[PDB]
Design a binder for these strands. Structure first.
Lengths: 58, 142, 206, 37, 175
RNA sequence: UUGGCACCUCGAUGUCGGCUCAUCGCAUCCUGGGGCUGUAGUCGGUCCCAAGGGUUGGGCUGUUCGCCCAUUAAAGCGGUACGCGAGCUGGGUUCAGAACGUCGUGAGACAGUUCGGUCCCUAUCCGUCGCGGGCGCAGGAAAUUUGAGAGGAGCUGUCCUUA
RNA sequence: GGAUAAGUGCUGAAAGCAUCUAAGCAUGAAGCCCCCCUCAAGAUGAGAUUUCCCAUUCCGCAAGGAAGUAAGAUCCCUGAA
């Protein structure tokens, strides 16, 4: 599961770190790395979860 | 219940050029692409990679004294059968094994290793025969 | 940078203008015809292909016909090839007689050496044997196989097999006399190959 | 030569110059020629 | 007290040409000489005044700031006046002459020794004893004359064979 | 190597020395390169780069070593179960037989000595030497090759000339 | 031959000089890689040229299958280089 989240992150410029450290501050979200991939195969909606954390990175 | 893609993969053709970089860090992120670990549909066992063409391999560089130091040891089976080759020997005599052997260690071993290894090819100079597939241009992260 | 090919017959003993007697082979090379001139622009190297025998009708195949019939001279049985000649001197179909060679130059000789069949590890590798008496039950055997600890036998230790048959060359030989009116070459020395077996005759690198 | 690990200059006019990774004594006298390694 | 920090000057007849990143060609009466330098070094040329400047004060820049000047200082001397190195041979049967350009040494052997002035370097032979190699490059004229000494180095018992102009030879008094 | 320790092996790992086939390291005996020399020259001493090649034939000894004879350019050292006994020999110690000296009243002993003493096997697997049958090599078949890649060979003395 | 090992060198700083250095070059060995020779495309990365044979008859809707041939080869038989 984790290297697929890597692979969804490098098309977004992020790391695996800045996702999961982001999602702890973006929400306090629980997205349990299996079902994180189930948003990855709906990648149009996944990056709204990603770039929200990117805004919460800054 | 995940998605395990098996031979339903839209494969790709990237070209990574070898202008002036270090062949460790130039084989670094190529080797992830050879298994396609950058692709979101990564199964770990059905070769989700894509093909890689390297151009201008003989013009690749090394810092330190590695142009003379890193002797590439191959061995026969006959007794006392090592055959030493230095880097500058590999560089100018024939370098089309000089990036292959730097990735043969970096692709994982097994039957699937050589199956992913067929996706690689390296051309000396600017040959790039390959005018029938629309190859893409890739730039590494560093 | 030359070469023709022929058929060995057997030794003679020929005088050469002194009491000096010379071991002499009898190489007969009926005039060879170039069957194909391979170029570097398409085949990647510079060579030429000879041919030598008078084939019959039933012997030939149809692909042996169409390879010849471009420069239609004759189907010839044995086909060999010479890297590194003057390509600018020859054309496809040229008849080459014995007129190349003289009786005084350094001449290379390859060939197909004789057979000895399944004969093993004294005659096949020149090794000695254990003593024939003092109670020893050891003679004609290939020696020890190796020490204990590497658990195998090294690739390069020698053993019984099938001696002879391989291709073997003898360098820097010399032609005794040229008799081109029966297409005969006489070469100083013992040349490998049994009776009626085929030999390339180059000019060596001195 | 004199090749020994305890290289040190002997006379007044000995010079200690580091060549090719090694350290050498080069003087007028060729007997003074020391080199570690 | 420094090699590099002073300047160099163009007296006359010398056109130093800053051409590329580092290839600087220097033309004139004796010859036309070229040299590639290191790209971190910056060499500015005033009106017949040669200035050499380094970026910082480091282990690289201490080494290169003196050399690139002094090589150009040698490129001034070769283009203006050139160089020459004489070679006197000492002994009894020792002699030397040219066959055109090829210097022939009838020195001590069972054969003559041929020397080829490959890159157009004048080897002037005034006599069978003195031989002068004349040219423009210290890394060539000094290079060739050393290999001439490599043909027959002098021996400390009787100093014979190839020898420089004022080459003081060590003397062993072996009985 | 002389040895320590007793960890594997006493429901068996046959042990010294030669013969057979050699392979490997370099602290090199010759051969190549050199530096210094108390290197005139010819020999030399000594460190340094060198492991591609070679390293003799005998009398004594069970011999290893070593002495010796005679050469050679050189007579290298060390592994590898003090290489190699499901390859070979049994002289050697280490079976009873026998005898000598000494020890012990004695049976008997002795890394003190001498004489005589059964060395087994038909090869599954890996490993080599050699040969072949099948399919592969996006059509079938016929001959020749480029060469990836490997292996073998890669030692030298006397004499002549310069003189 | 090519590139080097020890050396032997130049050039030349750092460190006005000296310096076989750090840049820049040249030499230099029975060593090393080719040159010499044999083996070699199962080198699954299966190479490259030369000519021959050609796209036939049936299912099947195709996919696919069998069943006679081409070129050539084999069984077999007289044979030993």
């Amino acid at each position: 599961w984790i290297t697929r989240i890597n692979a969804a992150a490098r098309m977004n410029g992020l790391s695996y770190s800045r996702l999961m450290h982001g999602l702890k501050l973006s929400g306090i979200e629980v997205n349990r790395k299996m079902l994180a991939d189930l948003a990855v195969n709906d990648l149009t909606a996944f990056n709204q979860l990603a770039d929200a954390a990117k805004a919460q990175l800054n | 219940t995940p998605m395990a893609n098996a031979s339903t993969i839209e494969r790709k053709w990237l070209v990574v050029d070898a202008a002036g970089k270090t062949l460790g860090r130039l084989s670094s992120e190529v080797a992830a692409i050879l298994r396609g670990k950058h692709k979101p549909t990564y199964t770990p066992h059905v070769d989700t990679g894509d093909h890689v063409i390297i151009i201008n391999a003989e013009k690749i560089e090394l810092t330190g004294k590695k142009l003379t130091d890193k002797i590439y040891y191959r061995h026969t089976q006959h007794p006392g059968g090592l055959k030493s080759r230095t880097a500058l020997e590999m560089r100018t005599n024939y370098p089309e094994k000089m990036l292959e052997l730097a990735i043969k260690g970096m692709l994982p071993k097994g039957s699937l290793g050589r199956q992913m290894f067929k996706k690689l090819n390296v051309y000396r100079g600017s040959e790039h025969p390959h005018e029938a597939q629309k190859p893409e241009v890739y730039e590494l992260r560093g | 940078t030359k070469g023709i090919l022929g058929r060995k017959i057997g030794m003679t003993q020929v005088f050469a203008e002194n009491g000096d007697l010379i071991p002499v082979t009898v190489i007969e090379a009926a005039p060879n015809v170039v069957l194909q001139k391979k170029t570097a622009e398409n085949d990647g190297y510079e060579a030429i292909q000879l041919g030598f025998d008078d084939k019959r009708e039933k012997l030939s195949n149809k692909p042996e016909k169409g390879h010849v019939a471009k420069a239609e001279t004759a189907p010839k049985r044995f086909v060999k090839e010479l890297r590194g000649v003057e390509m600018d001197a020859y054309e496809v179909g040229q008849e080459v007689k014995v007129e190349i060679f003289s009786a005084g130059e350094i001449v290379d000789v390859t060939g197909v050496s004789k057979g000895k069949g399944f004969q093993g590890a004294i005659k096949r590798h020149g090794q000695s044997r254990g003593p024939m008496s003092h109670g020893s039950r050891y003679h004609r055997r290939p020696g020890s196989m190796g020490p204990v600890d590497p658990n195998r036998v090294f690739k390069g230790k020698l053993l019984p097999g099938r001696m002879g048959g391989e291709q073997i060359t003898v360098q820097n030989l010399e032609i005794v006399k040229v008799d081109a009116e029966r297409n005969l070459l006489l070469i100083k020395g013992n040349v490998p190959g049994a009776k009626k077996s085929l030999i390339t005759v180059k000019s060596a690198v001195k | 030569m004199k090749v020994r690990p305890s290289v040190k200059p002997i006379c007044e006019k000995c010079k200690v110059i580091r060549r090719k990774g090694k350290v050498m004594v080069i003087c007028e006298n060729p007997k003074h020629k020391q080199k570690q390694g | 007290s420094r090699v590099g920090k002073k300047l160099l000057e163009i007296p006359s007849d010398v056109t130093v040409t800053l051409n590329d990143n580092n290839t600087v060609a220097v033309k004139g009466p004796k010859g036309e000489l070229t040299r590639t330098f290191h790209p971190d070094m910056e060499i500015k040329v005033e009106d017949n005044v040669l200035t050499v400047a380094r970026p910082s004060d480091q282990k690289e820049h201490r080494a290169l700031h003196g050399t690139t000047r002094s090589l150009l200082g040698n490129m001034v001397e070769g283009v203006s006046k050139g160089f020459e190195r004489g070679l006197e041979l000492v002994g009894v049967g020792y002699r030397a002459s040219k066959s055109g350009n090829k210097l022939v040494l009838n020195v001590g052997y069972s054969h003559p020794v041929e020397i080829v002035p490959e890159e157009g370097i004048e080897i002037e032979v005034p006599s069978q004893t003195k031989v002068v190699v004349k040219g423009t490059d210290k890394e060539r004229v000094g290079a060739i004359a050393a290999n001439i000494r490599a043909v027959r180095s002098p021996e400390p018992y009787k100093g014979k064979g190839i020898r420089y102009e004022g080459e003081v030879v060590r003397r062993k008094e072996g009985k």
